[PDB]
Design a protein around this ligand. Sequence first.
Ligand code: TRP
Ligand code: TRP
Ligand code: CL
Ligand code: MG
Ligand code: MG
Ligand code: MG
Lengths: 659, 652
Amino acid sequence: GRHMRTLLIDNYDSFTHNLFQYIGEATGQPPVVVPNDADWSRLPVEDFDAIVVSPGFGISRRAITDSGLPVLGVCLGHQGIAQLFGGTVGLAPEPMHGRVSEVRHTGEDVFRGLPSPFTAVRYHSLAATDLPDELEPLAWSDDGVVMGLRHREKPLWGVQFHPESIGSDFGREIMANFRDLALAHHRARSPYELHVRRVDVLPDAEEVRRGCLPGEGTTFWLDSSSVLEGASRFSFLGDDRGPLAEYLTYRVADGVVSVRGSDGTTTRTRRPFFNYLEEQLERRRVPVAPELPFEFNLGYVGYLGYELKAETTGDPAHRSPHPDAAFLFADRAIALDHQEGCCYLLALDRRGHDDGARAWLRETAETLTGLAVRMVFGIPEAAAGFGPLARARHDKDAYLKRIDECLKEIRNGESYEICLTNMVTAPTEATALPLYSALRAISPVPYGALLEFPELSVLSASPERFLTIGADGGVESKPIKGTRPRGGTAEEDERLRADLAGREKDRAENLMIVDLVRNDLNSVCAIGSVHVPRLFEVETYAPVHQLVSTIRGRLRPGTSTAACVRAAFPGGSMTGAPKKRTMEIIDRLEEGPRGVYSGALGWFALSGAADLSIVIRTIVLADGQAEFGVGGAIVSLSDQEEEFTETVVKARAMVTALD
Amino acid sequence: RHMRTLLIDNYDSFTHNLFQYIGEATGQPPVVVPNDADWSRLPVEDFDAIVVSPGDFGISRRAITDSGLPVLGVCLGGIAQLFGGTVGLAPEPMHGRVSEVRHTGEDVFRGLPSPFTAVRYHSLAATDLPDELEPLAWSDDGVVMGLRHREKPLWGVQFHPESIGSDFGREIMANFRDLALAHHRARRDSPYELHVRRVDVLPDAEEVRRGCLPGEGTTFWLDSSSVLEGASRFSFLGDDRGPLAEYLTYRVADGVVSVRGSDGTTTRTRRPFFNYLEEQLERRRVPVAPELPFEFNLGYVGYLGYELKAETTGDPAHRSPHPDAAFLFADRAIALDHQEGCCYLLALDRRGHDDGARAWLRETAETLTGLAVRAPAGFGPLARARHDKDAYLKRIDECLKEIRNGESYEICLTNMVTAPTEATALPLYSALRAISPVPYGALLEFPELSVLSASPERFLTIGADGGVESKPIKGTRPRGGTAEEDERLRADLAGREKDRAENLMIVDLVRNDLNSVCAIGSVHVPRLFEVETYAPVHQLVSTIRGRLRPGTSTAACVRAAFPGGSMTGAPKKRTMEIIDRLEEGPRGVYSGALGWFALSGAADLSIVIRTIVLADGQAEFGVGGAIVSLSDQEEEFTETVVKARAMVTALD
Ligand SMILES: N[C@@H](Cc1c[nH]c2ccccc12)C(=O)O
Ligand SMILES: N[C@@H](Cc1c[nH]c2ccccc12)C(=O)O
Ligand SMILES: [Cl-]
Ligand SMILES: [Mg+2]
Ligand SMILES: [Mg+2]
Ligand SMILES: [Mg+2]
């Protein structure tokens, strides 16, 4: 998009150029330095996204009162904020010049991620004694002096210490936090009215699907079938019956978006899907409700197929037999809060209509209250086969040859890691809901989904977070790579878990994906914002042990949520590195489409938030047959037989559901 | 100006990670260009450095061979193959796997621990490097992990600095930026020939002064009277008798530069001094001679007076009785290498001419050789302080009141002491250098005054490569009468909150000065609150380093940092105004800078403390100390008396 522009107001003290260095290192951009006595009217304040007020009347006041921009006051600037809003700046208990204090804080805003206490140098005889009602203290010295404050509403922050002093710690981190706060402010800067109703019941999610949604017709169920503090909390359900609901599909080959309106009309448009999605999410922007503990305030629920790579970094090598994208615009949704044991009902009216949103709220609420009442596959059994009626696109011998081709390409330096996949097809008479009811019992996961669309049903037991994007512009990806089968005993199982956490080969497979996802996020994230808070964590699900790494970033200003997904699509954890050359190798060897498998499934909120899973451990139901993808990383250290066995093991939850 | 980096994208999935690391390390994002860009249409001239990303790749090959820019090759970034090196199969393919990397700590590896952890993404490695290439780093399985071309500004790393599993990636990208800055500063016609002769003798320095320099003439002796490894090593002596020699003075009041040539005639020019000096050093540019182990390749030797502040960030509040600048343009000089026990003789001719530089080198070498055979290596009774004790105590009171109103955090308050003396320059300096051996001793014997410096303090040491170091001193103790007293006082100096605060505020101030002229990320403090012991006092000393931005002259760096933070205090502009009001007169040479500006672009400048100025049968010496909120009036006065001991003993 673009880089953030910081204004550094020089108040003519001997600190401005140290702050210059710290902003430059923290943000990857030098700030524009302007003297405090410059002409405000002249100054292109419009061009700037964040102001740092240096220590030492003038434009400092204007910046704080008039600019409407995020401001960080450093020392005399901090006192400026306290004063300008009717505070008392009187003498501290002890004058402190070039002297060190332990600063304790709440770890909020500019103090995010800093240890309490941390060491900071002070250069003042004056402190914010009596804080106004509009300001709140965030930090205090061992001396009892206010060291940090903020305005309760406005994006204004003060520190009564020098972050940039040689005797201070985490100076750069404080400046990076302010940049992040500035980005979050500008993202926060509508054709609908969002109605919300909390119901103090939590019925069984499957009872809600069966009781509240129609058996026949287009429906979604975002299923936290595994609920675990910090990993998953919410489930979402809806249908296309609402008067503002739409069903949207995309065909890469035609390049056309087909939208079936609530009217009945299907509109057709020749353009790329991510571009289409970006336009609609901008046009339909609705702010998050502060009484909602989640950020899905309605929007699009559905899937992005692998073949959409043709409009990201990939080639249109193969045609999916399924829509390359399929989404319900959910005008009406049921949210289950599994932590608090309540439901939230969300409904849209057009800004100037009573489209029966409030009527749906009260009726669904009455329906919900009436509904409120109260495995482990080890090797070698897990690696039996794909099922009795099942045909893999590539039989064992075919797949061993593609693995061999992968090892040659790696040896010739064309790829570092190839996520080679197979596609298995099995005739079934099973309908979506009973089959899904068996799958979710077999493999409880944080990112379960049942999509029941006209052209297909998607039965996902994915545990994998592709992208979680806040309305504030915060981004998290948790690529999974490195797999170990479960043990047929609990001894063998704790062993295989330890083996996965410690083996060089699996760590290398995962690390190369972390670097790849870091690269994708760095193309759309602010410089210095991309980091890896967690490397090589082991997660255990009913069918497999998984190596998982966590990568976070913060979107650049001008970068849409849709743009972020496009840049990272398809997921590095399903392609390998380098992505463009590897996707070409996958085109040649797999000799057909992945379809929904290896794509992304989840929601884009009208708030600009998103939560997308990677489509793995998924059954696509269409035209009397079940289709499921399986695969794994091929690296120089890969054994052909072991890699094939891993693909069979990963099929086991799906094979068991269909059995 | 900031440095511009071109990042060549070789269509791999590492480019935006390298982008992030360059951005954070250098404070500027690189311009990213794909490897299939048009070379003719690409404005390579507008860029200062190339990073070749991992991955036919045209722009990459032409970056390394065709362009004369600094290049860092990352993995695929070619340099081995292009210069007739071998690319062979490594003992094991390494993709996303960590190696322990051991290195020489040179160039891109500067300041990295050995070993450090690095992630590799390659099956192929450089095996047989040609003479022109040099290995810098090796893996724990014996593969070359880093290389450089011996002449061209080309570095290769056979690992990913920017990988999550690598350490010190940002430090590697910053090191490359520093090397790029160094290279361009060394490209920047010469009106002189530089002639160098090494003589493998080392006579007594004081005998070289007596023997090789004239008694009555205008001379310099930069005297490492203390010689300690990595602290001081060289002395420099010269006179104005050469044919290309000039004597040079400035007056702030007139704004006039006075140049006395070999002719004996004096030219006068109205020009800010730092502007004139910057102009001359640009026009008189001569590259460093690599056979010289020191950076002074001849140039200007002298002092910048405190009152020059009028043309930096200060006001012209008082007129010095002495020139505000005074330099000998030394066309001939003797360098003593106290470490290797040899002498180096430097002499300028005009380009294509013979002004007798070889004759002076040959003659002076003989004189040095024969000289080395004969000589191998309170304030005082008639002293008057500008401020008596009672007056100085009340000036300290005024300082405390300014600090109470938050106008200053630290004021370097000083006194000026004057005494009649019969002593002449050389004998009195002979006494001083025995009393207080220091790394930055000097005897300047100019027409208007003699300067007898026993200064231990480094103001600015600037490489030809644009590397800057400042070692501000703040925090003083008297010497103890025993070894055990000295240990107590050294411990006490390092530990006291007051002294640590005095020092830290100058470190912050000098960081601020260097950041105005230095590359973003380059300014750091490798040592904080180190105690150094000299004959007269224990000193608390901190070290600050940076790299000059491209298009910043050495003179512009001195201007930005002058006067020294260690002699003013923070904030400098307001604090210097308080000093103007309370000191009631000029500092002159005292509290200014004394040293050399080399034709190479290098410089080495001391702070003028522990110095006697001789003029009109009168001795003048400044003494001062930090006034802070914690300052006691009596103690701060006594510190000024303690700091006078060396000068008072020498005059006595
Ligand atoms: N687990 C998510 C909700 C969810 C369930 N299944 C999903 C599939 C895709 C995206 C999100 C989901 C949460 O707790 O908020
Ligand atoms: N100590 C310096 C030379 C030197 C001695 N006295 C000086 C005074 C000013 C500048 C330099 C010097 C060196 O070893 O290189
Ligand atoms: Cl990082
Ligand atoms: Mg620190
Ligand atoms: Mg594998
Ligand atoms: Mg690291």
